[PDB]
Scaffold this active site. Structure first.
Site, PDB file in Angstrom:
ATOM      1  N   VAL A   1       5.498  -0.760   2.986  1.00  0.00           N
ATOM      2  CA  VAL A   1       4.331  -1.061   3.823  1.00  0.00           C
ATOM      3  C   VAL A   1       3.296  -1.931   3.102  1.00  0.00           C
ATOM      4  O   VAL A   1       2.943  -1.674   1.946  1.00  0.00           O
ATOM      5  CB  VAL A   1       3.659   0.238   4.321  1.00  0.00           C
ATOM      6  CG1 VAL A   1       2.422  -0.069   5.153  1.00  0.00           C
ATOM      7  CG2 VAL A   1       4.648   1.070   5.122  1.00  0.00           C
TER       8      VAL A   1
ATOM      9  N   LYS B   1       4.905  -2.347   8.320  1.00  0.00           N
ATOM     10  CA  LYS B   1       6.054  -1.617   7.760  1.00  0.00           C
ATOM     11  C   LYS B   1       7.356  -2.370   8.025  1.00  0.00           C
ATOM     12  O   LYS B   1       7.688  -2.647   9.178  1.00  0.00           O
ATOM     13  CB  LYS B   1       6.132  -0.223   8.386  1.00  0.00           C
ATOM     14  CG  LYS B   1       7.247   0.680   7.871  1.00  0.00           C
ATOM     15  CD  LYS B   1       7.166   2.037   8.552  1.00  0.00           C
ATOM     16  CE  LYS B   1       8.365   2.915   8.257  1.00  0.00           C
ATOM     17  NZ  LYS B   1       8.095   4.315   8.706  1.00  0.00           N
TER      18      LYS B   1
ATOM     19  N   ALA C   1      11.754   6.032   1.507  1.00  0.00           N
ATOM     20  CA  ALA C   1      13.178   5.860   1.799  1.00  0.00           C
ATOM     21  C   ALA C   1      13.388   5.050   3.077  1.00  0.00           C
ATOM     22  O   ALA C   1      14.376   4.326   3.208  1.00  0.00           O
ATOM     23  CB  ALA C   1      13.863   7.215   1.919  1.00  0.00           C
ATOM     24  N   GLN C   2      12.450   5.178   4.012  1.00  0.00           N
ATOM     25  CA  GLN C   2      12.535   4.486   5.293  1.00  0.00           C
ATOM     26  C   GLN C   2      12.135   3.013   5.199  1.00  0.00           C
ATOM     27  O   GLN C   2      12.636   2.188   5.967  1.00  0.00           O
ATOM     28  CB  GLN C   2      11.647   5.175   6.325  1.00  0.00           C
ATOM     29  CG  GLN C   2      12.107   4.970   7.752  1.00  0.00           C
ATOM     30  CD  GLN C   2      11.084   5.414   8.775  1.00  0.00           C
ATOM     31  OE1 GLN C   2      10.011   5.914   8.430  1.00  0.00           O
ATOM     32  NE2 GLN C   2      11.416   5.240  10.049  1.00  0.00           N
ATOM     33  N   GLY C   3      11.221   2.689   4.283  1.00  0.00           N
ATOM     34  CA  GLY C   3      10.771   1.307   4.125  1.00  0.00           C
ATOM     35  C   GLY C   3       9.594   1.091   3.189  1.00  0.00           C
ATOM     36  O   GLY C   3       9.278   1.941   2.354  1.00  0.00           O
TER      37      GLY C   3
ATOM     38  N   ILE D   1       0.803  -1.240   0.000  1.00  0.00           N
ATOM     39  CA  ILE D   1       0.000   0.000   0.000  1.00  0.00           C
ATOM     40  C   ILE D   1       0.835   1.289   0.000  1.00  0.00           C
ATOM     41  O   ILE D   1       0.281   2.388  -0.073  1.00  0.00           O
ATOM     42  CB  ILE D   1      -0.992   0.069   1.194  1.00  0.00           C
ATOM     43  CG1 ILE D   1      -0.254   0.061   2.539  1.00  0.00           C
ATOM     44  CG2 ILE D   1      -2.002  -1.068   1.134  1.00  0.00           C
ATOM     45  CD1 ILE D   1      -1.184   0.091   3.738  1.00  0.00           C
ATOM     46  N   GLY D   2       2.153   1.166   0.086  1.00  0.00           N
ATOM     47  CA  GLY D   2       2.998   2.345   0.207  1.00  0.00           C
ATOM     48  C   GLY D   2       4.471   2.036   0.334  1.00  0.00           C
ATOM     49  O   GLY D   2       4.860   0.919   0.676  1.00  0.00           O
ATOM     50  N   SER D   3       5.284   3.053   0.077  1.00  0.00           N
ATOM     51  CA  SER D   3       6.732   2.911   0.046  1.00  0.00           C
ATOM     52  C   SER D   3       7.418   4.235   0.379  1.00  0.00           C
ATOM     53  O   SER D   3       6.793   5.298   0.371  1.00  0.00           O
ATOM     54  CB  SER D   3       7.164   2.426  -1.338  1.00  0.00           C
ATOM     55  OG  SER D   3       8.563   2.226  -1.405  1.00  0.00           O
TER      56      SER D   3
ATOM     57  N   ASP E   1       7.388  18.752   9.164  1.00  0.00           N
ATOM     58  CA  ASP E   1       7.295  18.155   7.824  1.00  0.00           C
ATOM     59  C   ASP E   1       5.894  17.625   7.464  1.00  0.00           C
ATOM     60  O   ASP E   1       5.770  16.640   6.725  1.00  0.00           O
ATOM     61  CB  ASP E   1       8.331  17.038   7.680  1.00  0.00           C
ATOM     62  CG  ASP E   1       8.608  16.675   6.225  1.00  0.00           C
ATOM     63  OD1 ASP E   1       8.568  17.574   5.361  1.00  0.00           O
ATOM     64  OD2 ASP E   1       8.852  15.482   5.952  1.00  0.00           O
TER      65      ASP E   1
HETATM   66  C1  LIG Z   1      -2.181   5.357   1.359  1.00  0.00           C
HETATM   67  C2  LIG Z   1      -3.112   4.682   2.348  1.00  0.00           C
HETATM   68  C3  LIG Z   1      -3.847   3.514   1.726  1.00  0.00           C
HETATM   69  C4  LIG Z   1      -2.384   4.247   3.605  1.00  0.00           C
HETATM   70  C5  LIG Z   1      -1.068   4.315   3.865  1.00  0.00           C
HETATM   71  C6  LIG Z   1      -0.877   3.777   5.187  1.00  0.00           C
HETATM   72  C7  LIG Z   1       0.191   3.538   6.072  1.00  0.00           C
HETATM   73  C8  LIG Z   1       1.613   3.868   5.737  1.00  0.00           C
HETATM   74  C9  LIG Z   1       2.506   4.259   6.734  1.00  0.00           C
HETATM   75  C10 LIG Z   1       3.828   4.551   6.447  1.00  0.00           C
HETATM   76  C11 LIG Z   1       4.280   4.450   5.143  1.00  0.00           C
HETATM   77  S1  LIG Z   1       5.969   4.806   4.777  1.00  0.00           S
HETATM   78  O1  LIG Z   1       6.770   4.319   5.857  1.00  0.00           O
HETATM   79  O2  LIG Z   1       6.233   4.356   3.443  1.00  0.00           O
HETATM   80  N1  LIG Z   1       6.152   6.408   4.784  1.00  0.00           N
HETATM   81  C12 LIG Z   1       6.018   7.234   3.576  1.00  0.00           C
HETATM   82  C13 LIG Z   1       4.661   7.915   3.575  1.00  0.00           C
HETATM   83  C14 LIG Z   1       4.427   8.665   2.272  1.00  0.00           C
HETATM   84  S2  LIG Z   1       5.615   9.963   2.149  1.00  0.00           S
HETATM   85  O3  LIG Z   1       5.513  10.567   0.848  1.00  0.00           O
HETATM   86  O4  LIG Z   1       5.502  10.813   3.303  1.00  0.00           O
HETATM   87  C15 LIG Z   1       7.129   9.064   2.248  1.00  0.00           C
HETATM   88  C16 LIG Z   1       7.141   8.255   3.539  1.00  0.00           C
HETATM   89  C17 LIG Z   1       3.420   4.045   4.133  1.00  0.00           C
HETATM   90  C18 LIG Z   1       2.101   3.751   4.436  1.00  0.00           C
HETATM   91  C19 LIG Z   1      -0.058   2.974   7.325  1.00  0.00           C
HETATM   92  C20 LIG Z   1      -1.360   2.661   7.654  1.00  0.00           C
HETATM   93  N2  LIG Z   1      -2.408   2.864   6.843  1.00  0.00           N
HETATM   94  C21 LIG Z   1      -2.147   3.411   5.642  1.00  0.00           C
HETATM   95  N3  LIG Z   1      -3.061   3.700   4.664  1.00  0.00           N
END
Ligand SMILES: CC(C)c1cc2c(-c3ccc(S(=O)(=O)NC4CCS(=O)(=O)CC4)cc3)ccnc2[nH]1
Length: 352
Positions: free
Chosen positions: A33, A48, A29-31, A25-27, A144
């Site tokens: 998900v 994550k 630099a940190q990891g 569901i997501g990505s 941020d």
């Molecule tokens: C998009 C939506 C379906 C969703 C994302 C998500 C996460 C989630 C948490 C962290 C990340 S991450 O560690 O990849 N951090 C990213 C977030 C997007 S950003 O552009 O800020 C780069 C860091 C990704 C998804 C956790 C729980 N429910 C969710 N529903």
């Protein structure tokens, strides 16, 4: 064995057997998900994976901070911890950290593409403000906030995903700086209301459906801000370092636009008398958040008390007991790789 492995893209997720049907569901630099079903809790969760978080100082500090804050923070407007694990069986073998979280439906980038009524818009903003204040009450200033790190559900409930800034790094991931305050852009000091600038950029974007200040770099970023809001007054100029001040005073001068012109009635529900009054109040709030000089910009509590927002006010949400942060040195650490490794491992295993 208590774990199984599944391939997610070019990554391997090795997780406890309770978690099934993983889907990305997501990505970042940190990891990476994945959404998943927890067979024990009988509900969907988010997982994550942090790959070798102790590899460098930026990743290590962020991962350690994330683990500590998720373990001590419990607020409805901050994403909540459910579990943490590692599949490796010793400190010597330790490699990866898995953080299990509440699963939400969508991010704010998705909501920004929709037209919102005043009830929903004001309730989303209220919740953002409660999450931010809660963090401030523990001495955490985010700095941020952006649409991609804020998530929602179909019932209009909202949670912040991250705990903010601390940083050179080898990465393909580009950094988004469109929501960062003037004081962060120009390298000044900052206080709590640095985060209100970001809420104003997000709000403006929810109304207009376009990024307010889409700068290519910090220099372009500043230009975009002054184009819309106008060159700041001499009183602000005098607060800058000489080298920065010369630069800012040497830019072409801009008059800016009134908030009536930036955010006209056509962008709001403005049919009924109810909606006309709300539009006026929404614009007033924007005019108090999108203020270059932080000393003249609104505080978080003033925003919570504003006519557009205060219909939702509940002290159990907006005046909750502060987080008990144990690590007094949570933002000022320097360690070796083996030291970060042991610190993080101890946190995952819950050792001292
Ligand atoms: C998009 C939506 C379906 C969703 C994302 C998500 C996460 C989630 C948490 C962290 C990340 S991450 O560690 O990849 N951090 C990213 C977030 C997007 S950003 O552009 O800020 C780069 C860091 C990704 C998804 C956790 C729980 N429910 C969710 N529903």
């Amino acid at each position: 064995n208590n774990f199984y492995s599944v391939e997610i893209g070019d990554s391997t997720f090795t997780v406890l057997k309770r978690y099934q049907n993983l889907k990305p569901i997501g990505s970042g630099a940190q990891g990476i998900v994945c959404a998943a079903y927890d067979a024990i809790l009988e509900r969907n969760v988010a997982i994550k994976k942090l790959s070798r978080p102790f590899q460098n100082q930026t990743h290590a500090k962020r991962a350690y901070r994330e683990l500590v804050l998720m373990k001590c923070v419990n607020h409805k407007n901050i994403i909540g911890l459910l579990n943490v694990f590692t599949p490796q069986k010793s400190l010597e073998e330790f490699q990866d950290v898995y953080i299990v979280m509440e699963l939400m439906d969508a991010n704010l980038c998705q909501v920004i593409q929709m037209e919102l009524d005043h009830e929903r818009m004001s309730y989303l903003l209220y919740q953002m403000l409660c999450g931010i204040k809660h963090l401030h009450s523990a001495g955490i200033i985010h700095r941020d906030l952006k649409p991609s790190n804020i998530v929602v559900k179909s019932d209009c409930t909202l949670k912040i995903l991250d705990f903010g800034l601390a940083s050179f790094m080898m990465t393909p991931y580009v950094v988004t700086r469109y929501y960062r305050a003037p004081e962060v852009i120009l390298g000044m000091g900052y206080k709590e209301n640095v985060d209100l600038w970001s809420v104003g950029c997000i709000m403006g974007e929810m109304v207009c459906h376009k990024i307010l200040f889409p700068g290519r770099d910090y220099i372009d970023q500043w230009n975009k801000v002054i184009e819309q809001l106008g060159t700041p007054c001499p009183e602000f100029m005098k607060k800058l370092q000489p080298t920065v001040r010369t630069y800012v005073e040497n830019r072409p001068k801009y008059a800016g636009y009134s908030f009536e012109k930036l955010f006209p009635d056509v962008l709001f529900p403005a049919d009924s008398e109810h909606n006309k009054l709300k539009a006026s109040q929404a614009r007033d709030l924007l005019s108090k958040m999108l203020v270059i000089d932080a000393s003249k910009r609104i505080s978080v509590d003033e925003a919570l008390q504003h006519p557009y927002i205060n219909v939702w006010y509940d002290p159990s949400e907006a005046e909750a007991p502060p987080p008990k942060i144990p690590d007094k040195q949570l933002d000022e650490r320097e360690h070796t790789i083996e030291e970060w490794k042991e610190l993080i491992y101890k946190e995952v295993m819950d050792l001292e």
